[PDB]
Symmetry: C3
Subunit: 341 residues, 3 copies
């Protein structure tokens, strides 16, 4: 958010952050929610907007993740990746259109509870149809309903097939949409998407069906120094899962997902957080029902100003030791310090 | 975008985000361009410092970040440094730079490398003098010691790069170019020759101690019209693969022709037509065979200097009985570009 | 650094360099000090600092290495890596604290002789406990002794365990510190650190012990355009080594290290250099004592201005062709041209 050019109708911001970060869990964290050890990383990105005329804007964004917890040896690149890369046009009262790597439209809903100091947002998987960042997506968005209805918003998204070398990262063609309304510091949102699955996905031992589906609804209140939000969603053939015992992977035939969060902002900078998150797989081959995620969160971010914060995030993991997929059951606490610009 | 300009130093950060999709028959396996999402971003810096009235120092770096991978194990596929060099420019005498930079024969091939998405097929990366290449020292003289506007020449020394593939390797070499541009007209010639490495000589396709590349070009660039043509030949330098025997190496000879015609409408549309043909000769076991053969029709629509969209359509004249197995199917690209 | 932002209490600089670089050694450089061939690279980084209140600033830095001597094929990313990524807080007259990937505290001493145009600094290994850049380190620093004594500094550093997939890049938990006094051209510094070795490091055939130790002292004279410095250090179980003959790796049970440098700065920009570096491993399994580094250096950098330089650096290698670890015995000369901002 450092504007490095603003002339001839063009404005570009370089942005990024350096995050010193450590995770603490029992042992070496192998059976924990979050893992153990150094988790330091940095982000870099640009975001630019050109005012083409008084009625039309063009824009672009790119965002990279650089892990800062690898050695300078052969593992140096582990977890480095492009998060976002897209370009688009915005025509006043008609809408915007962009194409590239961007957030799936179901995240329009899941974004409501994705507000924890470190963790949270567990169902917003990357490269997973409509719930997270995904490649090859064309997105149309409309604010205030062509200007006719203040606060009412909608979006329509086409997902292009990505035939990759893993089932986990692949998808077929799909289409999704979202609608929201925002009022006096409140919002309500619903979003839905459906897509073909690829042959490689259908071939996995877990999950069965030609189509993947995801939807979510969300409600939030954001004002008076208080933030409250809830999401409920369900998926079919879309949430990736691994049975740690049988070394087998694929997609959950169904999941039912709930996330709740409550936060308070003190004027002196401290922002306590609590939350609850549960994701339950159903009809899993050879298992039936089984929790994927189940925890309470207690944490806090201390904002010094717009550029600097520290935080702690504690996950009280309610997953138990006999979880049938072998999901980790131990707690994790993150401690972090962030410089951002 | 100018991010610094103080105490005689000027540095610009630049880049672009390109939303991009290719459409080809089926999975694109037998096509010119492939199929599917091809989105990417570029980031680079370019800087120049005033040392004294006669001398400026400069540096440039440019990276490609693919935007069409997942965030999993494949996340890095096709990520790479395109350019990385630093140099000194002595007024009325010339410039010297060293690093990863364009090969000098690209001084010619740049004339036709102007299509919305495709084109420039013979300017291979890491291929002696015709594209981007590492370990290259380049001397340039713009405007001929200051005496003649538009008259340029260059001499380039290529350092040996013994890499673990023949495709990406090269021995020591030397190359040069000369160009002259006057009132929208332009003519250029370029040639380079270099030793080949042991590993390159070991491949079953291609035989010779030296690689050579040369190309000439003519252009007309004015009155909103752009016309250009390149002709070139190579010896032991164009990489090829026989997909039927799974053998590879370099074409003993190629003869290459590229033509482009474009028109710029004031309202923003720039249509394009082109023709490209690269023919290999003396290929072991085969004789003559086409590597590239197509007509192009395309258009870029310029909103302004920072925003455009485009379509590029490759009408592939290659056919199904091509002796090397070159893809025969057409490809269409559609793109939207934000750049700064 | 190029200032891309300065307002509302926050200043951020983007910085970087492009380095055209070529090494010349006998043959293809396999038996040489430095190697042979193109070595061009670029650096990009950001560094930021925000004034939070009268006594407190927050800061962050990230720095990346992009190799420029690879092809655009499969080897394109070879040697790309994050060098630095950390964030911190600086409390006036009280000290600074940062966490992330940063210099080990023994480098507080080794920096004294790490001044050659291209080479030198041979004992400042990356990912090597306290002597170079390392991940997961928490560092407290105090400049000018709580504001009471100009030129008196100290630091205390905590190293978090990094259990990696190679012994070379791993470490256990550790602690070190440094102290320096720099009065009017003269400087003296001492630094020491110790840490647990991991099971994986213990399992290597070279090196035996539960703990790694490193310490070093430095003396410098930096004034009147003259730069003179000496470093002396010892290590236990901490310097990584490979026996190229037996093709086994691990750590030196002991090393004793000496680095010497002498430089002169002409006002017109030329800066000649001569140096000496010797590092000897002792009690090495199947060998006894063996030289790791042993050379004389002659070189020069020509500084055109703050943004541009060229250099030549020649390493006259004293290592013997019958070195028992197989250390390369051939000389290397580097020639570089650097644009930086
Ligand atoms: C500037 C243009 C950028 C190129 C856009 C590429 C669009 C590909 O994504 C769309 C895929 O199909 C959507 C599915 O709908 C049918 C469902 O049976
Ligand atoms: C005005 C020119 C002054 C030239 C002085 C001599 C320097 C040689 O370097 C230029 C070599 O260019 C080779 C051209 O290839 C043409 C293709 O056949
Ligand atoms: C005519 C001006 C001087 C040369 C200008 C550059 C053109 C180079 O083509 C001629 C070959 O160069 C020397 C030998 O190369 C063999 C490969 O190692
Ligand atoms: C001094 C002599 C005058 C030379 C004038 C410049 C000639 C440029 O040639 C460009 C011809 O391009 C045709 C492209 O067709 C593409 C459709 O298949
Ligand atoms: C509101 C929260 C305030 C928390 C600030 C957190 C800074 C992150 O520091 C991470 C600690 O790393 C420990 C490494 O040392 C291990 C030594 O054996
Ligand atoms: C404050 C104490 C600083 C002591 C600094 C001593 C500088 C040593 O310089 C290197 C020795 O060279 C010995 C022969 O030189 C020929 C090399 O080619
Ligand atoms: C007064 C001492 C200064 C030392 C300057 C040495 C520069 C001479 O070399 C050529 C110029 O550019 C350097 C890059 O070289 C790469 C060539 O492969
Ligand atoms: Mg099902
Ligand atoms: Mg031949
Ligand atoms: Mg020992
Ligand atoms: Na990278
Ligand atoms: Na299945
Ligand atoms: Na499945
Ligand atoms: Na538990
Ligand atoms: Na591309
Ligand atoms: Na060959
Ligand atoms: Na051959
Ligand atoms: Na790294
Ligand atoms: Na051992
Ligand atoms: Na060891
Ligand atoms: Na410099
Ligand atoms: Na020796």
């Amino acid at each position: 958010a450092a504007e490095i050019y603003n002339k001839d109708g063009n404005k570009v911001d370089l942005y990024g952050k350096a995050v010193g970060l450590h995770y603490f869990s029992k042992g070496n964290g192998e059976n924990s929610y979050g893992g153990n050890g150094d988790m330091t990383y940095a982000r870099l990105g640009f975001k630019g907007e050109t005012q083409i005329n008084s009625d039309l804007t063009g824009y672009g964004q790119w965002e990279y993740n650089f892990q800062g917890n690898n050695s300078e040896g052969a593992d140096a690149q582990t977890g480095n990746k492009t998060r976002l890369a897209f370009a688009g046009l915005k025509y006043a009262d008609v809408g915007s259109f962009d194409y590239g790597r961007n957030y799936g439209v179901v995240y329009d809903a899941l974004g409501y509870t994705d507000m924890l100091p470190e963790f949270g947002g567990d169902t917003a998987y990357s490269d997973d149809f409509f719930v997270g960042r995904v490649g090859g997506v064309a997105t149309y968005r409309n604010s205030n309903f062509f200007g006719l209805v203040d606060g009412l918003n909608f979006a329509v998204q086409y997902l292009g097939k990505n035939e990759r070398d893993t089932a986990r990262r692949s998808n077929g063609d799909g289409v999704g949409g979202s609608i929201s309304y925002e009022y006096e510091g409140f919002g309500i949102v619903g979003a839905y998407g459906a897509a073909d699955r690829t042959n490689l996905q259908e071939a996995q031992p877990l999950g069965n069906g030609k189509k993947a589906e995801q939807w979510a609804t969300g409600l939030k209140y954001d004002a008076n120094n208080i933030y409250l939000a809830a999401n409920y969603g369900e998926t079919r053939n879309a949430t990736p899962i691994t049975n740690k015992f049988t070394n087998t992977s694929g997609f959950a035939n169904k999941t039912q997902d709930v996330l709740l969060v409550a936060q308070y902002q003190f004027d002196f900078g401290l922002r306590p957080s609590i939350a609850y998150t549960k994701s339950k797989a159903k009809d899993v081959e050879g298992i039936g029902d089984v929790d994927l995620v189940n925890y309470f969160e207690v944490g806090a971010t201390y904002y010094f100003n717009k550029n600097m914060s520290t935080y702690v995030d504690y996950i009280i993991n309610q997953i138990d030791s006999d979880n049938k997929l072998g999901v980790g059951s131990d707690d994790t606490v993150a401690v972090g310090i962030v410089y951002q610009f």
